[PDB]
Amino acid sequence: TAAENPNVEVKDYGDIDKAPEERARGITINTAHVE
Amino acid sequence: AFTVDQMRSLMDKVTNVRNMSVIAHVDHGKSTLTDSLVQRAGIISAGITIKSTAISLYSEMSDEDVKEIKQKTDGNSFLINLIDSPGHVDFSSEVTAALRVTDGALVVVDTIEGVCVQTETVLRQALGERIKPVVVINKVDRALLELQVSKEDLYQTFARTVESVNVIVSTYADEVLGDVQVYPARGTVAFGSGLHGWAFTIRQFATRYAKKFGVDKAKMMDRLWGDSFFNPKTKKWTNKDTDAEGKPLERAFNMFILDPIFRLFTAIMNFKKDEIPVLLEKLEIVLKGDEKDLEGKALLKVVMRKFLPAADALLEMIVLHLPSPVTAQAYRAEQLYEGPADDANCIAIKNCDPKADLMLYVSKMVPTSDKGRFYAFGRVFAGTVKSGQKVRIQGPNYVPGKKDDLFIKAIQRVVLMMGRFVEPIDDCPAGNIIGLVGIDQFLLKTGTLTTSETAHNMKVMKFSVSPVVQVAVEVKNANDLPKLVEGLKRLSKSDPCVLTYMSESGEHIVAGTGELHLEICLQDLEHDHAGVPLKISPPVVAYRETVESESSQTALSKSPNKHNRIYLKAEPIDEEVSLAIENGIINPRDDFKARARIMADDYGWDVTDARKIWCFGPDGNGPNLVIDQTKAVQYLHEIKDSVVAAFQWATKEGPIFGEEMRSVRVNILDVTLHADAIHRGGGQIIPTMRRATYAGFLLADPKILVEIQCPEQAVGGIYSVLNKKRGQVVSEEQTPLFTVKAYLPVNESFGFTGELRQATGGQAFPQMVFDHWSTLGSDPLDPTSKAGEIVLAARKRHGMKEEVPGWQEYYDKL
Ligand SMILES: CO[C@H]1[C@@H](O)[C@H](O)[C@H](OC[C@@]23C[C@@H]4[C@H](C)CC[C@H]4[C@@]4(C=O)C[C@@H]2CC(C(C)C)[C@@]34C(=O)O)O[C@@H]1C
Ligand SMILES: Nc1nc2c(ncn2[C@@H]2O[C@H](COP(=O)(O)OP(=O)(O)NP(=O)(O)O)[C@@H](O)[C@H]2O)c(=O)[nH]1
User: Fold this and answer.
1) B545 C-alpha vs ligand 1 centroid, how far in Å?
2) Coil vs helix vs strand at B377
3) Is there a contact between B65 and B204 (Cβ–Cβ < 8 Å)?
């Protein structure tokens, strides 16, 4: 969507599973919100 | 990248807004799919950061596409709010809150694993919020690369996954919504690989082959799915999978959509460099520049992105099928609103009226980097919220009549919650999601903001949601206690599902939904919230000290002076009576006469004994009593205070190992005092009474609701576990699931939640509340009996001598 709208911040995979636990287990643990 | 003006303009056309989230079992690719959406349509503004809670997407559809949208549309631009949802799926209320602010959901299902319990759990909760679902069967690449699966097998797998899903939907979806099931032919199911950027709908292929087969796409998309066959030999479309001769016909879906894809994979991955250019040319795919040199997966990834852009498939289902707030608040108003259905605020919700009084629901408090400040996250259902606006904050217990939970305060700032960032804005009308700053202190977790004195307050899914896992927390360095007490408060505010309280034994308790949840909580508490070395350990269980029968013989004890003696016997107080005292039927301060009539007429007591209760204990109101049965003691009235005081002391600290007494009745049979008050003084009689009580006690044969919801076939595991833990079934009721109620000793509940999921295949959900005191039949004084082991462990833990002093130790022979 950010290709169509400059007003969308892109979030990459590692920006979403960013927690130290998530990295340690290699899964999502926390809900993440993106726009 | 848009400007605040562009965003605000986009937010005016709520007909072209989509509030939704992604539902997925761990590892099914929820993250990589959203990264795909964000990279393709994410929106960004043209030093305060927040935890990413929601992301905005932007999408434009073609004029023809927009005509297909079966709902009010204004133009070809769409604003999509991808709302973050927690990862704990125990039917928790944190999840329900997140879903509550969405109207549609993108459900991710794995090609191989299919629909798993976690998936069913969030979907079930979603359906309970009248959310419309759309599916994406993800990880398709695994079936082609790893498993080498065949087309018909892949098909069958897809069809079974779609069926599993529509079983959950048909079961929990409100009949008033109509058919909310999902159908590949209607474009509500996508297939693909979030890791590799390609996806499609039958519609896109219909558009592609319509103007080529000389047929309108409405006809084409019906033919591109299910039992439609095109016999190249007859050049005709039929619904029979065989021809006249009976030979096997390949399904249109396989022949026109899968085959081209299969051929691209096979040619590119096998380096057939003379077959790739032709295939690409036929599909009208153009490699430019450095792309012409790619091979293998690299070439594949690039070719599939051009052929069928993933985000494109997902955005198509979102825009065309997920519902836009005007449409939804019309049939969601009544549930959302506790008040009158005819009420002015309920109507404003149904109409999503921005000019009405305010009806803003606070979904949760979100952590910010603004030194311990939490911003309120929520949705404006009615009216419009403004910066510096005077509003009425109503907690979870507020009622229009009382002033409970009410908090009038101005809203400091209205901010757009964009990922980890915020953007101050002046106002926000009904139908939008928004963040409020300055509400921290007044609200923790859910709430309801209104601008009407009449306004009533606002309301929750088949993961654990109860704080069943708990530990005792304490600072390693005494002086740190202040930070710990403060950290717990900070921790509680940031986590809705976390619980902290002080135990009967004086320990700070922290409890979490599950072992993992509790672990994050303790880590965060220790590292951030409190930031001090913490010591973690199990909770100490409290016990009661009672008697099973009357004293086998009169208890006799003398005072230090050796001049005073008390003669008494102890006997059990009936449970119904102890309960009556504990719960308010028999009270310490009631008029002794009326109380005695009740104890005698209703509980079998002798009315004289009752009229003569001297006190309750411990703390003057406990379920233990001293009754006066003496006949001619001269200075009785003068020792009463000493006797009462000694009882408060005796019942507070039992002789078995220092636990409080319960259900203990003490009858004073006789008292012999010295003639002169000097030697009769409390300092003489208080010890006597306490010593005699302990003796009467020891001479009286001393002794010291788990609700589970689950499927039938799983119930067997429940009985299996319970039997392994001195459990006992109580009730088995019920066309939802089953609910087994049972008694489970507290000292048998550590790890129970784990052994239960393991014995029910993760289908059982426990709930536990303290129920009763229960008398252990074993000897408390026998170090090897069940009760005795507990007594020996507590004694050693407290540095007392192991042997329990026996009654003879408090008996003073005449
Ligand atoms: C809403 O959540 C509830 C449930 O988790 C449960 O009812 C739990 O029980 C706590 C205990 C409560 C009992 C009464 C106060 C008297 C006896 C108490 C207990 C002591 O052994 C039994 C349970 C478990 C406890 C020790 C081991 C911590 C209790 C305690 O508070 O010490 O309390 C919380 C607040
Ligand atoms: N082959 C292939 N792999 C993919 C695709 N989409 C995601 N993956 C891979 O599958 C793995 C899991 O993706 P991920 O997005 O983290 O899964 P999840 O569903 O978010 N995780 P969890 O359930 O723990 O949240 C990753 O290694 C990712 O590269 C795809 O389209 N094709």
Assistant:
1) 18
2) strand
3) no
Tell me how far the alpha carbon of residue B26 lies from the centroid of ligand 2, in angstroms: 9
Contacts 24+ apart (CB under 8 A), B230-233: B230/B255, B230/B256
Asked if B109 and B178 sit in the same domain, the reply is: yes
For residue B490, the one-letter residue type is R
Comparing alpha-carbon positions, the chain B residue that sits nearest to A28 is: B26
Q: Which residues of B touch A12 (CB under 8 A)?
A: 35, 39
Q: Resolution reached, in Å?
A: 8.9
With contact defined as beta carbons under 8 Å apart, do B80 and B18 qualify?
yes
Kindly give, in sequence order, each residue whose CB lies less than 8 Å from that of residue B198, ignoring residues fewer than 6 positions away.
Answer: B192, B304, B305, B307, B308, B309, B310, B313
Please report, to the nearest 10 degrees, the dihedral formed by the alpha carbons of residues B379, B381, B386, B387 taken in order.
-20
Q: What angle do CA B415, B61, A11 make, to 5 degrees?
A: 45
Overall number of domains in chain B? 6
Cα–Cα distance for residue pair B557/B696, rounded to 1 Å: 10
User: B430 Cβ partners below 8 Å, 6+ apart?
Assistant: B325, B348, B352, B353, B354, B356, B359, B380, B381, B382, B383, B384
User: Considering only alpha carbons, which residue of chain B is nearest residue A9?
Assistant: B44
Residue of B nearest to A20 (CA): B520
Residue count (chain A): 35
Question: CB-based burial of residue B410 (10 Å sphere; 0-12 exposed, 13-18 middle, 19+ buried)?
Answer: exposed
How far does Cα B696 stand from its chain's mean position?
Answer: 50
Name residue B378's amino acid.
Answer: G
Chain A residues closer than 8 Å to B53 by CB: 33
Spacing, Cα A12 to ligand 2 middle (Å)? 13
* B12 in the same domain as B161: yes
Based on the fold, state whether residues B438 and B298 are members of the same structural domain: no
Interface contact flag, A4 B40, Cβ < 8 Å: yes
Residue B658 and residue B739 share a domain:
no
* Judgement on whether residues B183 and B196 belong to the same structural domain of the protein: yes
Show residues of chain A in contact with B315, CB under 8 Å: 1
CA angle, residues B714, B108, A35, in degrees to nearest 5: 130
What atom in ligand 1 is closest to the CA of residue B541? 21
Is the same domain home to B507 and B582?
A: no
**CATH number of the domain encompassing residue B489:** 3.30.70.870
Rounded Cα distance, B319 and B82, in Å: 12
Closest CA of chain A from B793, distance in Å: 37
Ligand positioned closest to the Cα atom of B498: 1
Contact B35 A31 (CB under 8 A): no
- The rounded distance, in Å, linking the Cα atoms of B645 and B711 is 55
For residue B701, say whether it is annotated as part of any ligand binding site.
no
Judge: B55–A35 Cβ closer than 8 Å, yes or no: yes
**Burial call B66-94: b when 16+ CB within 10 Å, e when fewer:** bebbeeebeeebbbbbbbbbbbbbbbbbb
Residue B63 contacts residue B413 (beta carbons within 8 Å): no
Return the ligand 1 atom nearest residue B770 CA.
7
Q: Whose CA is nearest to atom 4 of ligand 1?
A: B769
- C-alpha distance from residue B277 to each of B197, B263, B274, B292 (Å): 21, 12, 6, 10
Contacts with B37 from chain A: Cβ below 8 Å: 1
Query: What is the domain range of residue B370?
Result: 325-461
Residue B757 CB–ligand 2 contact under 6 Å: no
Provide the residue ranges of all domains of chain A, joining segments of one domain with +: 1-35
Structure tokens at B164: 């599993």
Q: What is the CATH number of the domain that holds B575?
A: 3.30.230.10
Q: Does residue B19 sit in the same domain as residue B135? A: yes
Is the domain of B517 the same as that of B420? no
Distance between CA atoms of residues B92 and B245, nearest Å: 59
Q: Alpha-carbon distance B381 to B96, whole Å?
A: 17
Q: How far is the CA of B543 from the centre of ligand 1 (A)?
A: 12
Q: Binding residue per annotation — B353?
A: no
Q: Locate the DSSP E strands across B351-412.
A: 359-367, 374-382, 384-386, 390-394, 406-410
